[PDB]
Amino acid sequence: NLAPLPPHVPEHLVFDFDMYNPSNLSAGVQEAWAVLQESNVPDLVWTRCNGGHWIATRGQLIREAYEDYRHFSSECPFIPREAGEAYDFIPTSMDPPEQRQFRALANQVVGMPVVDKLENRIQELACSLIESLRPQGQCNFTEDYAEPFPIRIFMLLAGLPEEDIPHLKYLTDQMTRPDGSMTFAEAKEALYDYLIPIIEQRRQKPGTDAISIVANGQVNGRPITSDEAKRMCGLLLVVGLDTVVNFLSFSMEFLAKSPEHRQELIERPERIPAACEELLRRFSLVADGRILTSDYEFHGVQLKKGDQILLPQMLSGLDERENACPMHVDFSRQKVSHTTFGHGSHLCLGQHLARREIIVTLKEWLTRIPDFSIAPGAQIQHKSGIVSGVQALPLVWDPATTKAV
Ligand code: HEM
Ligand SMILES: CC1(C)[C@@H]2CC[C@@]1(C)C(=O)C2
Ligand SMILES: [K+]
C-alpha cells in the first residue's frame, strides 16, 4: 500500500521501494537494495511505501546524515513511524550529548575487554558445533550453526537460560522483520515483560553477567535507573540475537557457492581477516534511519521537520562510487570501504565480538569441512528488513573429504 504523497515532495523524486519486501528480492537482498543505485535513480528519493519516507542511496549522503545528529535524530530510528516512535532502546534512541554517557556503560559489557574473556569459550563452541556436524555430511546452517553459535555465546554473557532462546529470538525478529502477528510496540512490551523482573532480581542480588553489570551500573557518576537499565538490556537482546546470526549465513552461502574463494582461504589462512572485511562489505545487512529535527535543505532536497529518512548502512559499501565493481568479491581489494557497522556517534560497539565470531567461523569451518555446497535443487531465499537475512541454508558435503581435529 502506498501512502499519499506529502505536499513538499516533488514527483520526480518518487521511487516506491519497500524495505520489507523489495521488488528484486529473488536476486538476493543486497542486489534488491542495489536497484536504488541504478543510473536513473537520484541520490535521495522518496518512497510511498511503509507510511512514506526518504531514502539516501549513496554512501556520501548516508555518511553525512549519520554525522549530523543535529538535523538527523535517532529519537525515531525505525520505519514505519509507529515502530520508530515505540523504539526507545538505549543508547540507540538517544542523540549526543545525552547518548554518550550510556554508550560508555554499554561498551563495558560488550567491548573488546569482554571478547578477550570469552575468547576460549567462543573458540570451543565453534569447534564443538562444527565437529558434531562434520560426520553428517549435511546441515541446515541457519538453525544448526548460524543461530546457536552467536546466540549461545550471548546467552552465556547475559546469564540467560538457553531454553529461552526460541521466545526471545521470535520477539527480536518481529522488531526487524515482522511477520505481521506483532507490532513493534507489542514485541517491545513482551521483551520488557521478560526483562523487568530479571533486572530487579539482579539489582537485589548482583551477578557477574551482562544484565547484572548494566542493572547495577553507573551513568557518568550516578546510579542507572531501573527503566534505563531495561531500555539498555532490550537493545542487548536484539543485537545479540539478530545481527551476527544473519551475517554468518550470507557469508557461508557465498562460500558454499564459490569453491575458488574457499580454496583461497584454505591455501592462505592469513587472508581470513581481510576476507572477513570484504564479506562484511559485500553482504552488509543493516538499514535503519533518522528523523528530521527541523526543516532542512539536504543535497538540494527540501526535508520537512518530522520526515523520516532511511540511511541504509548496507548501501555505502555497495556504492560503485566507494568501491569499483561492488558486487564482485575480492579478498585482495585494496581499499575496502563500508558502513556495515554504522557511522557517527552510534558506531557499533559489538563489532569486535562480531569480527571474532566471523573469523573463528571461517577458520574452524574450512579446517574441518573444506568442500561443501548448497543442497541439491535448493533455492536460497533472503528476507529484508531493518536487518536482512537468509531464510534457510541447506548444505551438503562428503564426510570423506572432511578432517576431524
Ligand atoms: C554483523 C554484526 C553486527 C552489525 C552489522 C551491527 C551493526 C550495528 C549498527 C549499524 C549500529 C548503529 C545503528 C544506528 O546508528 O542507529 C550498531 C549499534 C550497536 N551495536 Fe552493533 N552490529 C553487529 C553486532 C553487534 C553485537 C554482536 C553487539 C553486541 C552483542 C552489538 C552491539 C551494539 C550496540 C550496543 C550498539 C549501539 C551503540 C549506540 O547506540 O551508541 N552489535 N550496530
Ligand atoms: C539497527 C541495529 C542493527 C542497531 C543494533 C541492533 C539494531 C537492529 C538496532 O536496534 C540498533
Ligand atoms: K522513539
Cα–Cα distance measured from residue 265 to residue 197, given in angstroms and rounded to the nearest whole number: 46
Grid cell, residue 119, equals: 575468547
Cα–Cα distance measured from residue 117 to residue 186, given in angstroms and rounded to the nearest whole number: 35
Residue 77 CA, closest ligand 1 atom number: 16
Domain that holds residue 262: 1-405
Cα–Cα distance measured from residue 156 to residue 227, given in angstroms and rounded to the nearest whole number: 23
What CA–CA distances, in Å, run from 222 to 96, 198, 217, 301, 356? Answer: 18, 21, 9, 43, 33
Nearest-5° Cα angle at 130, 125 to 133: 130
Grid cell, residue 358, equals: 566471523
Q: Are strands 288-292 and 308-311 parallel, antiparallel or unpaired?
A: antiparallel
What does DSSP assign to residue 7?
T
Cα–Cα distance measured from residue 301 to residue 10, given in angstroms and rounded to the nearest whole number: 9
Grid cell, residue 139, equals: 546441515
Was 276 annotated as part of a binding site? no
Protein residues placing their CB within 5 Å of the ion ligand 3: 76, 87
Query: Which ligand gives the minimal distance to the CA of 94?
Result: 1
In the beta sheet, which residues pair with residue 389?
Answer: 383
CA pseudo-torsion sign 93, 97, 101, 106: positive
Q: Would residue 366 show up in a list of annotated catalytic residues for this protein?
A: no
Cα–Cα distance measured from residue 404 to residue 275, given in angstroms and rounded to the nearest whole number: 24
In the beta sheet, which residues pair with residue 14?
Answer: 46
Residue 238 CA to ligand 1 center (angstroms) comes to: 10
Deposited experimental method: X-ray
| Residue whose CA lies nearest to ligand 2 atom number 7 | 239
Q: Would residue 349 show up in a list of annotated catalytic residues for this protein?
A: yes
Cα–Cα distance measured from residue 330 to residue 81, given in angstroms and rounded to the nearest whole number: 38
Residue 141 CA to ligand 1 center (angstroms) comes to: 23
Cβ atoms of 286 and 342 within 8 Å: the answer is: yes
The one catalytic residue in 81, 100, 134, 177 is 177
Helices (H), 223-350: 226-241, 244-257, 259-267, 272-282, 313-316
Q: Would residue 350 show up in a list of annotated catalytic residues for this protein?
A: yes
For residues 23-55, one letter each, b for 16 or more C-beta atoms within 10 angstroms of the residue's C-beta and e for the rest, the string is eebeebbbebbbebbeeebbbbbbbbbbbbbbb
Cα–Cα distance measured from residue 341 to residue 196, given in angstroms and rounded to the nearest whole number: 29
Grid cell, residue 300, equals: 538540494
Q: Residue 225 CB: number of other CB atoms within 10 A? A: 10
Cβ atoms of 217 and 229 within 8 Å: the answer is: yes
Q: Three-state DSSP class for 319?
A: coil
For residues 297-317, one letter each, b for 16 or more C-beta atoms within 10 angstroms of the residue's C-beta and e for the rest, the string is ebeebebeeebbbbbbbbbbb
CATH number of the domain where residue 112 is located = 1.10.630.10
The one catalytic residue in 28, 350, 385, 389 is 350
Q: Three-state DSSP class for 45?
A: strand
Residue 284 CA, closest ligand 1 atom number: 5
Q: Would residue 49 show up in a list of annotated catalytic residues for this protein?
A: no
Cβ atoms of 250 and 283 within 8 Å: the answer is: yes
Q: Are strands 296-298 and 218-219 parallel, antiparallel or unpaired?
A: unpaired
What CA–CA distances, in Å, run from 155 to 6, 116, 188, 241, 388? Answer: 45, 17, 19, 9, 22
Q: How many domains does the chain have?
A: 1
CA pseudo-torsion sign 308, 314, 316, 321: negative
Cα–Cα distance measured from residue 68 to residue 65, given in angstroms and rounded to the nearest whole number: 5
What CA–CA distances, in Å, run from 332 to 256, 313, 329, 361, 365? Answer: 19, 22, 9, 20, 21
CB-based pocket (< 6 A), ligand 1: 74, 77, 91-92, 103, 106, 110, 154, 235, 239-240, 243-244, 247, 286, 288, 313, 340-342, 346, 348-350, 353-354
Place of cell 549461545: 152
For residues 319-332, one letter each, b for 16 or more C-beta atoms within 10 angstroms of the residue's C-beta and e for the rest, the string is beebbeebeebebe
Grid cell, residue 371, equals: 568442500
Residue 247 CA to ligand 1 center (angstroms) comes to: 13
Query: Which ligand gives the minimal distance to the CA of 280?
Result: 1
Q: Would residue 217 show up in a list of annotated catalytic residues for this protein?
A: no
